[PDB]
From a paper:
[name] ([name]) is a part of this module and modulates the deubiquitinase activity of UCHL5 in the INO80 complex. [name] enhances induced pluripotent stem cell generation and knockdown of the [name] gene affects the reprogramming process leading to a reduced number of human induced pluripotent stem (iPS) cell colonies.
The structure of this domain was determined to 2.18 Å resolution and reveals a novel helical domain ([name]_WHL) bearing remarkable similarity to a winged-helix domain, usually associated with DNA binding. The last 12 residues of the construct (residues 484–495) were disordered and were not modeled. The [name]_WHL structure adopts a fold similar to the winged-helix DNA binding fold, comprising of four α-helices, three 310-helices and a short β-sheet composed of three β-strands. Therefore, despite the structural similarity to winged-helix DNA binding domains, [name]_WHL is unlikely to bind DNA. The calculated isoelectric point of 4.3 of this domain is also not favorable for DNA binding. [name]_WHL has a significant structural similarity (Dali Z-score of 6.7) to one of the winged-helix motifs within the C-terminal domain (CTD) of the cullin protein portion of the of the Cul1–Rbx1–Skp1–F boxSkp2 SCF ubiquitin ligase complex.
Author numbering:
A (entry chain B): 370 to 439, 444 to 461, 464 to 483
B (entry chain A): 372 to 462, 466 to 483
The structure:
């Protein structure tokens, strides 16, 4: 997320961090999101107001993106042996945006 | 990493930050290639105009202070040097730029 802090959805934001890291732990993704949400410009994201604390939603977003919610195709996987999240965003943003809204409607 | 920016104004200033200096046709070619990317239409403000590259000059002239629809405490974000024909930034303004962008949208026509 170099240019700026603006992404099409929370889901695309996560997958954009993962494309750059290639692999990443949960604690690292959490810290990246926390730093990201503290930046004044991030509230310019149209979906930023959909939750009060985005860092805390990193795990449940990843699990949904992994297909652990309940034919969807997984965007990420977690490997227990390495404790790393991996990609399995570009051109999928429209789908991710739709899936994000669905998750927001269905999660709580 | 994606073609998403908070406003057309922030998109223009981000292209200037990298580049550091740029000509009008350079900026116009960059915006043309941007708007032709699929990802670009994801910008919430993309549809506020049908052709963004054709608005690069008036946008820059707005951000340069060459337009009267600006607040009293308006400090210009860019300048154009005629001797060089290059646009440059003037040395965390995104929220202000978003608001200024809407001001421009509302007042330009
Ligand atoms: Na962006």
């Amino acid at each position: 997320l170099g240019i700026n802090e603006i992404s099409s959805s929370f889901f695309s934001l996560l997958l954009e961090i993962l494309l750059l890291e290639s692999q990443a732990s949960l604690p690292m993704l959490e810290e990246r999101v926390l730093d990201w949400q503290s930046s004044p410009a991030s509230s310019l994201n149209s979906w930023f107001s959909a939750a009060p604390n985005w860092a805390e939603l990193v795990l449940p977003a990843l699990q949904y993106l992994a297909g652990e919610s309940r034919s969807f195709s997984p965007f990420v996987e977690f490997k227990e042996k390495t404790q790393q999240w991996k990609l399995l965003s570009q051109d999928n943003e429209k789908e991710l945006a739709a899936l994000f809204q669905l998750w927001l409607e269905t999660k709580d």
